[PDB]
Hints:
By secondary structure, chain A is an all-alpha fold. Chain A has ten helices and no strands. Chain A starts with a helix and ends with a helix. Chain B is mostly helical. Chain B is globular. In chain I, α3 (about 35-45) runs antiparallel to α5 and α4 (about 50-60) packs across α8 (about 125-145). The complex binds phycocyanobilin (CYC) (11 copies). One phycocyanobilin binds next to α5 of chain B. The PDB classes it as photosynthesis. The entry lists the keywords complex, photosynthesis. In situ PBS-PSII supercomplex from cyanobacterial Spirulina platensis. Chain A: Allophycocyanin-B alpha subunit.
Amino acid sequence: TVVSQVILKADDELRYPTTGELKNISDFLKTGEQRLRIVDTLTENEKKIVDRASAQLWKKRPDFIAPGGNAAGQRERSLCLRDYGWYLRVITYGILSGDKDPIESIGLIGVKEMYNSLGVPMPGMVEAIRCLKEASLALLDDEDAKEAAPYFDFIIQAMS
Amino acid sequence: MQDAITSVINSSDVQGKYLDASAIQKLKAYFATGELRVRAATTISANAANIVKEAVAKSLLYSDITRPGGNMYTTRRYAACIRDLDYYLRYATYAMLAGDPSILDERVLNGLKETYNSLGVPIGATVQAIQAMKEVTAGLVGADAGKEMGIYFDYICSGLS
Amino acid sequence: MQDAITSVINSSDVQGKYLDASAIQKLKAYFATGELRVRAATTISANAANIVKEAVAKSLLYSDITRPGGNMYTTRRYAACIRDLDYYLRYATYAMLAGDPSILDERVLNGLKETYNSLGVPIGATVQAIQAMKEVTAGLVGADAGKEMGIYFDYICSGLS
Amino acid sequence: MQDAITSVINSSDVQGKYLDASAIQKLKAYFATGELRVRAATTISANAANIVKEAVAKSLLYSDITRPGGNMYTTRRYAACIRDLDYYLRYATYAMLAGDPSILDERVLNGLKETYNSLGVPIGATVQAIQAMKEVTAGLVGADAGKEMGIYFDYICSGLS
Amino acid sequence: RPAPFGKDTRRILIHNGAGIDNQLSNPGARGNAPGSLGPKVFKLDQLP
Amino acid sequence: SIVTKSIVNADAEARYLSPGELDRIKSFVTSGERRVRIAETMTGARERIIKEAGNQLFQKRPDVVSPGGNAYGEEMTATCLRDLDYYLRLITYGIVAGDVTPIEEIGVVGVREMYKSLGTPIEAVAEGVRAMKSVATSLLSGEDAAEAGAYFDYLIGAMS
Amino acid sequence: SIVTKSIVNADAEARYLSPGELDRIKSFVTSGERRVRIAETMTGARERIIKEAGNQLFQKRPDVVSPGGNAYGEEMTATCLRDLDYYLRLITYGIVAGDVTPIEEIGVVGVREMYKSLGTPIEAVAEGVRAMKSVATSLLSGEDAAEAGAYFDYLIGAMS
Amino acid sequence: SIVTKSIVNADAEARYLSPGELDRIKSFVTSGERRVRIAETMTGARERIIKEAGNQLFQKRPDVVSPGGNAYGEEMTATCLRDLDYYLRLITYGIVAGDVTPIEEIGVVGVREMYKSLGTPIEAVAEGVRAMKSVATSLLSGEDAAEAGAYFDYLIGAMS
Amino acid sequence: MRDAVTSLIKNYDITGRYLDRDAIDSLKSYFVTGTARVQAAATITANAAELVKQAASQLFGDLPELIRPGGNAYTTRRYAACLRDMDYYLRYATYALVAGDTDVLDERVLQGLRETYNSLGVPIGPTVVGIGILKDLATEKVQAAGIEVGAYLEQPFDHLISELSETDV
Amino acid sequence: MRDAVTSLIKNYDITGRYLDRDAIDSLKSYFVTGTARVQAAATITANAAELVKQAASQLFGDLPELIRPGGNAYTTRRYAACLRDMDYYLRYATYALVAGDTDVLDERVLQGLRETYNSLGVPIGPTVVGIGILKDLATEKVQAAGIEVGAYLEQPFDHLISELSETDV
Amino acid sequence: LGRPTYGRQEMNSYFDLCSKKGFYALVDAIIDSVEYNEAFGEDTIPYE
Lengths: 160, 161, 161, 161, 48, 160, 160, 160, 169, 169, 48
Ligand SMILES: *[C@@H](C)[C@H]1/C(=C/c2[nH]c(/C=C3N=C(/C=C4\NC(=O)C(CC)=C4C)C(C)=C\3CCC(=O)O)c(CCC(=O)O)c2C)NC(=O)[C@@H]1C
Ligand SMILES: *[C@H](C)[C@H]1/C(=C/c2[nH]c(/C=C3N=C(/C=C4\NC(=O)C(CC)=C4C)C(C)=C\3CCC(=O)O)c(CCC(=O)O)c2C)NC(=O)[C@@H]1C
Ligand SMILES: *[C@H](C)[C@H]1/C(=C/c2[nH]c(/C=C3N=C(/C=C4\NC(=O)C(CC)=C4C)C(C)=C\3CCC(=O)O)c(CCC(=O)O)c2C)NC(=O)[C@@H]1C
Ligand SMILES: *[C@H](C)[C@H]1/C(=C/c2[nH]c(/C=C3N=C(/C=C4\NC(=O)C(CC)=C4C)C(C)=C\3CCC(=O)O)c(CCC(=O)O)c2C)NC(=O)[C@@H]1C
Ligand SMILES: *[C@H](C)[C@H]1/C(=C/c2[nH]c(/C=C3N=C(/C=C4\NC(=O)C(CC)=C4C)C(C)=C\3CCC(=O)O)c(CCC(=O)O)c2C)NC(=O)[C@@H]1C
Ligand SMILES: *[C@H](C)[C@H]1/C(=C/c2[nH]c(/C=C3N=C(/C=C4\NC(=O)C(CC)=C4C)C(C)=C\3CCC(=O)O)c(CCC(=O)O)c2C)NC(=O)[C@@H]1C
Ligand SMILES: CCC1=C(C)/C(=C/C2=NC(=C\c3[nH]c(/C=C4\NC(=O)[C@H](C)[C@H]4CC)c(C)c3CCC(=O)O)/C(CCC(=O)O)=C2C)NC1=O
Ligand SMILES: CCC1=C(C)/C(=C/C2=NC(=C\c3[nH]c(/C=C4\NC(=O)[C@H](C)[C@H]4CC)c(C)c3CCC(=O)O)/C(CCC(=O)O)=C2C)NC1=O
Ligand SMILES: CCC1=C(C)/C(=C/C2=NC(=C\c3[nH]c(/C=C4\NC(=O)[C@H](C)[C@H]4CC)c(C)c3CCC(=O)O)/C(CCC(=O)O)=C2C)NC1=O
Ligand SMILES: CCC1=C(C)/C(=C/C2=NC(=C\c3[nH]c(/C=C4\NC(=O)[C@H](C)[C@H]4CC)c(C)c3CCC(=O)O)/C(CCC(=O)O)=C2C)NC1=O
Ligand SMILES: CCC1=C(C)/C(=C/C2=NC(=C\c3[nH]c(/C=C4\NC(=O)[C@H](C)[C@H]4CC)c(C)c3CCC(=O)O)/C(CCC(=O)O)=C2C)NC1=O
């Protein structure tokens, strides 16, 4: 959130937070009930999303389900369906916090090489989040589609 | 560093579930008190050389401690003592801005209890100076936000004693 | 000539005190009934003339008070009694929106009482008419507002008698 | 007195028709500028006495008018002048929120061509005090409203001459 | 000479007396005596 | 309207507009889109409103259409059907202006003396205003029937 | 308050409370929690306001404490600061009541003839209440210091 | 500004512009028309603020004006109004920028070494800018005086 | 008579000042619309003799009290006089459209018009409807010619409505 | 680093003046484009990791004289270093697009860049073509995103061209 | 009342009152107004 950007920004310069960020703190804290229109409409519509994007991935790139792929067995596909709603959980942490600080330190720092420790390649899993964005933004209303769209958009850049 | 926003992120993430109703009742309480805490953090920083002055001029000057013999006789002890009381007030306002005392657990109460007995610093006098600094601060910001520092001023005094 | 806000000011201006929490409790009981009083004002706006008619058709106009021999018989005495039963209501909802009978103390009760002892207007018919106006007000605005409407009518019954 | 809301109503009523789409479109042009007018009123009424003080020192003080012989000599004729400039400021801000100078045709500019002649007030100094008042209230309210404030000052300024 | 006057208009009048003591500025000052500038106000005190 | 009613109240006290009065204009100007949307439902469906409330008045008071009445016959009823066009035009002028003075100067002041000279019963045409309140609330929303219906309850007490 | 101001102005015309001004009673009486919360900050910090504006007043005017003036020793300076506490009570009474009218009934309308009779200088009291504004608005938030600053501005206009 | 401070923080982590600072900046730039009509009124009344806070300072601190103080004499007390002319001029740069990096780089970072080298008391300026705040909050409306008054309150914390 | 330029002259002449920054930007606001003013004034006079004929037949088909023997448009002595007295409202609306403000309308047509029609028995009522049928229309031939339309091209027409018709509210 | 606001501060600070009418209208000209600045900066970072990949494959398909063993983009030691050294030009173009002027580009990326590339043998030539391919391939995703485009968002880029490349004429 | 009439709505309220009630309530309605009683009092001769 915005508040841990400011305290960790004012500790090493040894100074109180000035008005340039205290106006920036108070502007985030009046937008909670605007952001809470987005966070529950992702929440109870989770299972509608989680396989509408999962069918969207394999109709676009079927090699993770192809024999010799990654989720060719059911114990991998049960893992990979779980990771969508894990990514839908941490994205909704970011829309609540309004920043990057939960979405950094849970599911984004170091994923570029620790999928490579597993079998799953990187840029197909970039396609999994990009189809998950349009599976969620079609469910979202349009005037608040543009607010939650950069939070999905950061995961595309940081993973690829 | 754990904000009260990020504290209920982490307590929801250790269960791996989404935000429930009782978690959101911590956020919507915290989103309600946003403008109150920002008004307090301005007027402390405009008075942070006077809150640190009227705390020590009330409780510690002309005492045993400013007199020759104990712990604030020389000027370098006085400069070190006003360095602490400035730093307690500067670290109390972050917990007022966060709404969580995890700043005080991480950045203040780590080595401080061990290094005061190791230096011969009277804990019983510096638990009183922060206690004297509370009702200066509760008068300087207004008693609605004066009941907000009292959690985080005495979180130091709960840890340092 | 003053409302419930400045009543608990003037109740607390004397003996020098400030607004204590019992006095704030009296203010909070007026503020939560702010929704009930103003829609009770607009309910009797549209039916101000019919409520004078339906009061006197229930009680007054078939008796010997309106017969010759009585005192509501001629039209110049009919026009004043139908002016009074209008203006008893027209100051009642002024006192209902204010929140005390202090309006009724200063512009109903100090002059209307000893006038009727010197005019020969009968006064037991008035309280018999203001009770007939009391039940038909609660039958028009609803019983949620009538139980606090009738105390202002019963202030007129207490002072006229 | 014609509000800019009521001027569209008085236009649309005398034709007999209801509210057209074009007549609704004029009110939305007023309502989009409604924030800019109500900002300008509250930033004046806090310091309406200060604008009067800053306008007499710009154009009227240390002149022939405030000297003996002039018309702002002998403080009967000076306290009347300072409230006179208070009148134009108070009636410009009513004409601001009305969005229509119809107040100034009714309550301001009736006698002021003849009452200043019939009191010996020089119009050539109060028409410059108005323009000096516009040049300080454009700096006090802002560059955007001060053009639109300056419409209703120059309606008074052309009405005096 | 007619003139089309409005629905509500205020004729501007001059206070016969003190200049600031017009009632349009201060309505709480109209009960005052006008003093030496205005005319003589009479009142009844002594009844025989 | 709202401001020119509050200007002429602020002129008799000889004072600028209070900050307790200026936020009334500030709230009314920002809530200007909603009250216009109330007004188009009055104008766009007014042939339903007069014809239903005209039927409701002649059932609540059948003495008007009787012989020896004011609105008797085809012609004389047609202006009583047209007088309710006039009062409904003042309500839809009133909710746009937000106040009572566009209604008060046009239809409220002389109305005790007007219908006195024309021979109609004044409260009977005032009863049809009360029936016109009931139909105009039936085509209206939850909050909008309470706000726009308050001027309807002005007008029944205006004539009575 | 605004209730009695909308009753006295409704009684001189003898009208039944036109629904333009009943919307004022809708937003006065429901919004009393905002206004009484300003009064808790003044009453809760009563002992700080008077003492911090006491010595600030005596710095501006050292004639008053010094012998020759009107407050010598502890005894007259105690009632000097009690006299400010009569006004801090009165500003608290004006904040709850919406407008200025419970102050002229208590503390305005004889204060020039009073203080001339007691021998105290009238404008030195006006420096005291001006010093009380300089501490109270620092304690208060900015959107509420316009409201409390109006009643503090009146009292300087009352004594001077 | 805030836009420099959002870039410079995002440049240090070497990522792109976050969805956090995309919305701090967008909320700044849609408040950009509001802050300039705050900052114009300071510059539109700069001769009144300097004259009133100059009147407000010297009665609070008469050791300065009295001989042997620093601003003594008609050339020296003209410089102390010029010494406050700069700090009012700097605050209008901070209101426009939305932060205090115009205040910091120009009027903060070497103040106590300079004013010790000039002979003036440092805390006497901190009363004067605080007295300059008390006439600036009487200019603006209430919701803007909390914004522009915070930039005054930053400058007090740099002095003392 | 009195242009928007010359109204800004004696808005500045009587206070004795030069042309400042506000004078140089309000006058440029008039000149950027001057191409749209003149080309709208051409197409208003494209069929201006037809434009009064389409309006009054749309008037008298809307208010048929003014044809049947009632208020004065009864004979062709009245009706052809009505079309002429309509045509002044179209012709003077062309002038103030070009002139910027309405001060040409203020002292050529509006002064005495409440007193001329009262002396004849001509109603002021449907005259407001007669300008109300033109100001909305006039906009049709500006729209069908391709010129934008809105701020002005009504600036003149409802100044013939809000100042001619008597104030009710 | 140095915003268009803060560049106008020390355009006015060094002469010791307040904010006049020219300051109040040039700064409003920045703020009316600020909605168009930020939403263009979102969609530039929509596929910014893809946008360098589409540009450099369109670069090296256009100038093979940088794939075959010649100038230094030969191995993946060079090529993945080339995609990173391309990606700084995209990332710093986002900052100055939001910041208004190019002073963020002036003292973060441009200073020393003639002297870093000469010390390595990296040519300055196709780097200008690499920003010139990013010149129009940034405008495509602003155009397909519905943002208007114009000098803003097509300027940061040629300030990386007209000041990095050496002057010929 | 010692002043001229104030405008039009202040005079239209008097013209209908002598149209219905007569002259005897016109001279009443001037006297029991607030502007007579609170600006002159109940024991003063009126003055202009
Ligand atoms: C039926 C309602 C009762 C009744 C009434 C009746 N009233 C009068 C005369 C007067 N009543 C008043 C009333 C008021 N004066 C006030 O100031 C207030 C407070 C608002 C009130 C309610 C006044 C002034 C009069 C005198 C009127 C006058 O012009 O003289 C009469 C007397 C009429 C007469 O002359 O005989 C009567 C009979 N009559 C009943 O039967 C009921 C008891
Ligand atoms: C003050 C009224 C009391 C007091 C203070 C005092 N402290 C020291 C020495 C130190 N104080 C600290 C403090 C902190 N370290 C932290 O990380 C934090 C959280 C921000 C704090 C508050 C440390 C590390 C030291 C030792 C190192 C140093 O050089 O200061 C002294 C000096 C002791 C000496 O003998 O010189 C004093 C005087 N002591 C009292 O007497 C008061 C009760
Ligand atoms: C057509 C075969 C028949 C016809 C039709 C007609 N006339 C009009 C319009 C008007 N007619 C008049 C008539 C007269 N004016 C006079 O002064 C006299 C002498 C006393 C007469 C008979 C007038 C003034 C008009 C114009 C006003 C109006 O609309 O009535 C119309 C309407 C035209 C239109 O739609 O604009 C029609 C269809 N006239 C004839 O002569 C034939 C009998
Ligand atoms: C017709 C649509 C409307 C109507 C018109 C009508 N007008 C008249 C007579 C006159 N109209 C004028 C008006 C002007 N003269 C001017 O110089 C100007 C400014 C340029 C105006 C607006 C005048 C002076 C007259 C008198 C005759 C004359 O022109 O000298 C009549 C004739 C009345 C009669 O019956 O003789 C008519 C019918 N009347 C309507 O009903 C329509 C609303
Ligand atoms: C596909 C079956 C065959 C193939 C095709 C291919 N490669 C490229 C692009 C590149 N290839 C290289 C190759 C190397 N880099 C090294 O460091 C080494 C070890 C010495 C090798 C072999 C590089 C750097 C590129 C990128 C630059 C370039 O465009 O050449 C393409 C073009 C891809 C595009 O269009 O963007 C194609 C079609 N590569 C194979 O391995 C298969 C033999
Ligand atoms: C690729 C499309 C082009 C190209 C790139 C290339 N660059 C390098 C090496 C470096 N580039 C930089 C540049 C910057 N560093 C900065 O901090 C900034 C400002 C943010 C810039 C612009 C630097 C410092 C290097 C040196 C390595 C390092 O980053 O530490 C290489 C490597 C050279 C080699 O062969 O080893 C390459 C290939 N070269 C081209 O041909 C294309 C035009
Ligand atoms: C909290 C942040 C976080 C997440 C979400 C996470 C997920 C995660 N995904 C895994 C595997 C996997 N992930 C995938 C995913 C895919 N293959 C494809 O073709 C698709 C593009 C993509 C489909 C969604 C598959 C198939 C496996 C199983 C591979 C294996 O374990 O053998 C594994 C290892 C085994 C397991 O637990 O299932 C972890 C720990 N780890 C983390 O630290
Ligand atoms: C051995 C080294 C040593 C030093 C340096 C020292 C300074 C010292 N000076 C003090 C007070 C003081 N010191 C002064 C002195 C001065 N102010 C003036 O205006 C005079 C010109 C000036 C004299 C140089 C004053 C007035 C106080 C009291 C301040 C107050 O109570 O607010 C106090 C606080 C009271 C106490 O606890 O003692 C300390 C610690 N004490 C020490 O033990
Ligand atoms: C014959 C009746 C009469 C009086 C009294 C009068 C006073 C009067 N005093 C003025 C100014 C002034 N008067 C003073 C006088 C004083 N300031 C102080 O601080 C002291 C308390 C005080 C006297 C000891 C000052 C300083 C000014 C100019 C205001 C300024 O410089 O800002 C002005 C404005 C400029 C001028 O014309 O001089 C008038 C009109 N005019 C009159 O017609
Ligand atoms: C907006 C509506 C309005 C106007 C126009 C107005 C004018 C006005 N000016 C008056 C007096 C005055 N007005 C002035 C004002 C001036 N003479 C000067 O030299 C200066 C140029 C100028 C003001 C700075 C003076 C000097 C008098 C006193 C004349 C006298 O009392 O004989 C009076 C008579 C006393 C009174 O009743 O207040 C009126 C009515 N009052 C109003 O309510
Ligand atoms: C906008 C302000 C306005 C009002 C108030 C108004 C009233 C009005 N009502 C009229 C007639 C009438 N109005 C009625 C109406 C009614 N009679 C009944 O019996 C019903 C109970 C009641 C209505 C439901 C009748 C019967 C007449 C004809 C009276 C007659 O011609 O003798 C007339 C005369 C003919 C006309 O021009 O319509 C006027 C002027 N006109 C206005 O312009």
